[PDB]
Structure formats: C-alpha cells, structure tokens
Ligand binder design. Structure first.
Ligand SMILES: C[C@@H](NC(=O)c1cc(-c2sc(C(=O)N[C@H]3C[C@H](C(=O)O)C3)nc2CC2CCCCC2)cc(C2(C)CC2)c1)C(F)(F)F
Length: 227
C-alpha cells in the first residue's frame, strides 16, 4: 500500500459511515433539549414486555440495516467472497450497533435517544432485564467520555466489522490484508489528528463481544426472530 492511498482509504470510511449513520449528528446534538415527561415514561413502563420487545426488535434491525448499508460502502468489502462477507457481518453487526449507541448517549443525564426524544433507563422497566439494559448505558457512557470524533467512529467501526480472527472465514488472508490497511488508515489519522492517545483508552477485545454476546444469548433462549 501507499501513504497517499491510505489517506484516500480514510476518506472513504469516514464518508461511507456518514452516509450510513442512520441519524445525523447535528440532529441528536441539537434536539437533545427535550426529554420524555414523567407521564411519557410511565406509558412506556406500562407497556407489556412484548410491546417494548417489539419496539427494540424493529429499531435494532433498522439500525443494523444501516450497519450493513455501511459495509457495502467500504471500498474493499465487495472483492472478497460472499461467505466472508456474511461471517464478518454476523459477528460484527451487533457489535457495530453498540459502538454507534454511545453516539446517541448524553453523559450529562444518562439519556439515550429512543423514538424522537431522549429518556433515561426507567423507560425500559417493561422489559424487566436491568443488568442487560444498564450494560449498554454504562458502556456508552465511557465511550461518550472520550468524545469520539465522527471520523474515529467510522474508523473504529470498520475494524469492528473487519476481523480475520473470526469463526469460519474462507479466504482469510484477504481479510487479514484489508483488516490491516484499515488499522493503518486508523493509526495514521489518529497521529494525523493528535488523538493517538486514545489507543490505550479504548475497550479491549473484548467488551464488544462479551456485552453483545449476553444480549445475543438471551434471544437465542427466549426468541424465534432473527437468530
Ligand atoms: C435484546 C436486548 N437488547 C436489544 O434488543 C438491543 C436493542 C438495540 C437498539 S438499536 C436502536 C436504535 O437504532 N434507535 C434509534 C432508532 C430510533 C429512532 O428512530 O428514533 C432511535 N434501539 C435499540 C433499543 C435500545 C433499548 C434500550 C437500550 C439501548 C438500545 C441495540 C442493541 C445492541 C446494539 C446491543 C446489541 C440491542 C433487549 F434489551 F431488548 F432485551
């Protein structure tokens, strides 16, 4: 690879994400002024667990379609065989949607954006799974502390999808090579922006799989939808 070409690689990842980011950043930041009234929360709490479950299931799949919408935008994704394309998304999709959640988390009052307005965690009392609902807010809270620049989330997300150290990829060396160019464009931009300091600050391995695996595991037990 070439240096001038790697900088090109960064511009694609940053753009492919900004066009497949679901919600605009300028929207979440400015519309953060209003939140659910205590009335509106009890209405969400009164909802049957199936009610709230049907909600997240849609918003989750919808947020994932943008995740896969992101993958097909990367400049080197299409070349590799379909199987590797399927595997990377299966294990990376749910984790990519987690990193994108902190981007909608307001660390000031612990309120995430869910259906046209910010709200706390008591909004999901109908579900009745505290430790799982809180594992996301606390995680996004830490990630929201670093004050992720949009370009970083795009770069970080790319390395979440790409991962040759995945279950059953076929032509892995095509995944290893690309997984490295992204890390190159990642570190280069970090140093190029004086934010190489975060590398020792991010979640290891690790928290992405363990946190999602707990959710993905509860659905493989109780559900029948996509699984
Ligand atoms: C099974 C288990 N977990 C999930 O169902 C689940 C839901 C979501 C998503 S994605 C999403 C969106 O895209 N919201 C956008 C679209 C909305 C809009 O258009 O306004 C805002 N909303 C949600 C629902 C929110 C529920 C409260 C905790 C934050 C997540 C994300 C995930 C990941 C990424 C962890 C794996 C898991 C469960 F907790 F459900 F039991």
């Amino acid at each position: 690879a070439s240096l001038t070409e790697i900088e090109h690689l960064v511009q694609s990842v940053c753009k492919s994400y900004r066009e497949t980011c679901q919600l605009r950043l300028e929207d979440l930041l400015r519309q953060r002024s209003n939140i659910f009234s205590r009335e509106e929360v009890t209405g969400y709490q009164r909802k049957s667990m199936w009610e709230m479950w049907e909600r997240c299931a849609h918003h989750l799949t919808e947020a994932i379609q943008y995740v896969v919408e992101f993958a097909k935008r990367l400049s080197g994704f299409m070349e590799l065989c379909q199987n590797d394309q399927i595997v990377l998304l299966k294990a990376g999709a749910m984790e990519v949607v987690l990193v994108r959640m902190c981007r909608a988390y307001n660390a000031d009052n612990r309120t995430v954006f869910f259906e046209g307005k910010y709200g706390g965690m008591e909004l999901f009392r109908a579900l009745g799974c505290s430790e799982l609902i809180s594992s996301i807010f606390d995680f996004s809270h830490s990630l929201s502390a670093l004050h992720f620049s949009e370009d970083e989330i795009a770069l970080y997300t790319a390395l979440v999808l790409i991962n040759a150290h995945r279950p059953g990829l076929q032509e892995k060396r095509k995944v290893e090579q690309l997984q490295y160019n992204l890390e190159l464009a990642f570190h280069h931009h970090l140093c190029k922006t004086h934010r190489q300091s975060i590398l020792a600050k991010l979640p290891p391995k690790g928290k992405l799989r363990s946190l999602c695996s707990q959710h993905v595991e509860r659905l493989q037990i109780f559900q029948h939808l996509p699984a």
